[PDB]
Design a binder for this molecule. Structure first.
Ligand SMILES: O=c1[nH]c(=O)c2nn[nH]c2[nH]1
Ligand SMILES: O=c1[nH]c(=O)c2nn[nH]c2[nH]1
Ligand SMILES: O=c1[nH]c(=O)c2nn[nH]c2[nH]1
Ligand SMILES: O=c1[nH]c(=O)c2nn[nH]c2[nH]1
Ligand code: NA
Ligand code: NA
Ligand code: NA
Ligand code: NA
Lengths: 295, 295, 295, 295
């Protein structure tokens, strides 16, 4: 036997940071969950108990806090690039750093219609994420995403025209509920290193904003032919609005809402145009995925 | 042996309802999770396999959908009162109905600054709940709550002056992070039946709004002496703004955020007035509770 | 307004303890999650920012570790009694201590058919729990339970004879799947204090063993008429086997497994006596509860 | 823009199956959660609302139940191969089927020391899984795994000799707790189709048994130098015991258990050789991974 691949590090490192404007007194908070996995010349830790090649995961954790203390933690694309670059430059034998960041929402509260200087609400469980891969001699690969964005439209979704054979029982519909949890990923052109990542810093928050905005508008306004058709329209538009992105990926569950036939009860009409009350189904769920790039 | 208490029913009934304005075309959605437990002359089901006294839980489920079809599902206080009253009036031997409702958020989206007629976002995992107990000959007891309201303030929380003995290591602080998940419950004066519950329908949404508003404002503006001191101020105010409430209960975890001493690293200053980066602690957590009533 | 009730403390305190036999070299591990809530003369912390009456939750946490260091942590009934007694005796103004313990499974592994001296497996997520209430001048009230015990029988469950009216669609059945998650609670006669709790220490592990044994055997062998009928038989038997118990409570979900009609597909027979493949339903679920005492 | 990749299907399909021996009366149950994702000539569903190419996810679900009715569901390697082969052979334009199966434990109960014919316990949340990829013209690729196998040893784990620099605070240790959740994956040599998968059916249960057995024994008996060193020994051995496996992957969290210094309390000794009580840490956690193949 032989080691064919190996990576190790620290997962589920919770990190909070506050910025305090000494002038205005306005404070701002950031909270993330960070994972850093390293690869490089570490096989001997596995095959011969050689721990000299191991940067202890506890030191990785300390390094995450130290880097957050010494650098901006926003946008997460930048912070993860700084953190992965640190490990491949500090440690001669570490050749790749894989950094995942989950950003948690802390939205400033409005009290009496005015923004509060230091009080915040988790207005939703939606996350903003990055996957930053810093590879020696291969630059910096960033995938940005939003996830846990849960939406529903009560009409203006259709699904008809699908294959029908002896395994098919689904009825065609011209009017149904569509609900999903949006997982949207935009993959950035390769960056040569930290200077290039820094040089594009504004595009990270802009592009996240755009992806979110396009996702919500397209969802709301598309008279959807299918989840497949609607997500492609989302991906297309994002691609057309930020040239530094190479691909857009969607992963969307179809969170089904079933009609309930109550006709058995005093002739009640609750189906088709008369449908008012529905049974949300926890499982199973369709799962629809696509990666869209440039023609 | 003897049966000393017994209740049974259907739990985790997911229910969606849509309202469609035929005029404006504006649609509105409601989604809840409903539990209905019955008590009454049912002991023989337990002691002698007498299932004649059992309203099957499947029929309870059908009844929930049927009642949602035939009645408003909002405010949840009303819907749960209608549902519990149904069981104690329909079934001579059923003498109490315990109804719990969890209302899920489906907030109308704004697209291009204007409200969409049929698209919605789960803007947060915060819930609005009711516990409605309909008891034959004892009226209707309603407890309303909000839960999962997650908040943080980065300053203007203190904790000093607490008991110190040989078990104490906590340092007094004059400036700390305070974060919690708000579980707030207001308990309504007894209602004689469904007519009285209906007669006060507007107060249910008003009072939920108030509790939420008071919770957030007090949290944001109180230079907090403790979680205990701050929650009492919240409870007091709600009591003073709605006379039909008899008590207000809070259950608040103290979700600790620990300073991180980095002085061991190149003399870095990250404590006290220099604290920027903190470690959010998943567990353990203080848990602070109180029930406040009228003097 | 006035404080009507108040309690506070530390929740979700994870605790591990190891015992090392210096002789045999056999080690044994215990792992729990502990919550301690205190009540007493603490209202002023809420109404006037008087933190002098507060035993900080951090000190409560230290006290849990200190007590586990100085005392056996098993059986949990004993450990929780020692811990609650500590707070009401140490602090003149603390008059009640509410202690909840969740015991996690660490079962010794058998390697090559022989018990290993220091390696363990979480053989299941089933828990053993206690709720110990130590109240000044009111002794010690203990409720013991097992929970998360997940079981299924594929036959020898029936449900017929239940009420049928216009809300009923459930078909009677003489052969169905029954699956549940057992939550079983035995409530001990009041104990005058720690000496009496100690005097009965053997009965705690014995009685837990019995409840589990009776639960599983009755479940397996009862040709069940209903969940109601089967759980009562369990409760009865436990009551008859340990006289120091006053009541036995069960809370049992009916985790439904639905038949799937495939007759629409090449005449396939999958219902009634031909049922092989079923759809386990995550929600909703019947919920059946009872408390049985002595006639 | 252009579709670069696309797959869709049904996720979280719960499936139960019972086998009933008409002779002995012994019944046996199987329960899984199945996901089937298809790829092929489906891009037009995304780009032009062409649903003709879509096998509805609801039909995929029906097909899962139908296949479970018509075929053995065990070993899961076989069942997933049958299911993926069905889709690529039935549908000319579907060219790959990705099938994931999670098998849930239903272990036969022993009542009074004898195996019960139809009653079962979820003895643990550990799962047995398969990932079966059926690709037209590329055979069948199977990855088998076990996951959620939670273990702890109280001694005979060490960690010393790791890199130390200005970011390091971890103390070397010669005696620590090691606990993890085992995720172990063995990847099978490519299979040409269903006949070859069938021809090796016995090796699937045998090899799962072996991997589990090796995992537990190595964990228990290795005086571990690191998680890295111990997992490699596990992977090596499995590779040496089943030649049809090409690689073995482990993903292991280091679920830390921290010593608690109580020396501040009456000089209590709870560290090093005196350590009895520890604080299990929920997060963060080291994460150690490796893929081992043949030299
Ligand atoms: O077994 C271990 N491996 C590591 O890489 C590590 N880092 N900290 N502690 C550790 N323990
Ligand atoms: O055992 C059962 N008890 C009930 O109350 C019930 N209702 N539906 N199915 C049921 N099964
Ligand atoms: O607000 C607080 N209340 C308490 O009871 C406490 N104990 N520790 N920290 C605390 N903070
Ligand atoms: O939008 C949809 N896409 C699908 O592939 C599908 N299959 N069933 N329902 C569906 N709805
Ligand atoms: Na390097
Ligand atoms: Na009645
Ligand atoms: Na006292
Ligand atoms: Na094909």
């Amino acid at each position: 036997s032989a080691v064919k691949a190996a990576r190790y590090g620290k997962d589920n490192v919770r990190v909070y940071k506050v910025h305090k404007d000494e002038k205005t007194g306005v404070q701002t908070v950031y909270e993330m969950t960070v994972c850093v996995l390293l690869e490089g010349e570490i096989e001997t830790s596995y095959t011969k108990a050689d721990n000299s090649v191991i940067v202890a995961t506890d030191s990785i954790k300390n390094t995450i806090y130290i880097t957050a203390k010494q650098n901006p933690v926003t946008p997460p694309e930048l912070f993860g690039s700084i953190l992965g670059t640190h490990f491949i430059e500090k440690y001669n034998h570490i050749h790749a750093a894989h950094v995942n960041i989950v950003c948690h929402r802390w939205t400033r509260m409005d009290i009496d219609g005015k923004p509060h200087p230091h009080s915040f609400i988790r207005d939703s469980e939606e996350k903003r994420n990055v996957q930053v891969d810093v590879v020696e001699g291969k630059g910096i690969d960033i995938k940005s995403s939003l996830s846990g964005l849960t939406v529903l439209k009560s009409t203006n979704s259709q699904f008809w025209g699908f294959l029908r054979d002896e395994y098919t029982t689904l009825k065609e519909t011209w009017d149904r509920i569509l609900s999903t949890d949006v997982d949207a990923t935009w993959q950035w052109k390769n960056f040569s290193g930290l200077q290039e990542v820094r040089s594009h810093v504004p595009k990270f928050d802009a592009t996240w904003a755009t992806a979110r905005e396009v996702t919500l508008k397209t969802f709301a306004e598309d008279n959807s032919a299918s989840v497949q058709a609607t997500m492609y329209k989302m991906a297309e538009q994002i691609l057309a609005r930020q040239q530094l992105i190479e691909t857009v990926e969607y992963s969307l569950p179809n969170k089904h809402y079933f009609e309930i036939d109550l006709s058995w009860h005093k002739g009640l009409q609750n189906t088709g145009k008369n449908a008012e009350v529905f049974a949300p189904q926890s499982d199973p769920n369709g799962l629809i995925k696509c990666t869209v790039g440039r023609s």
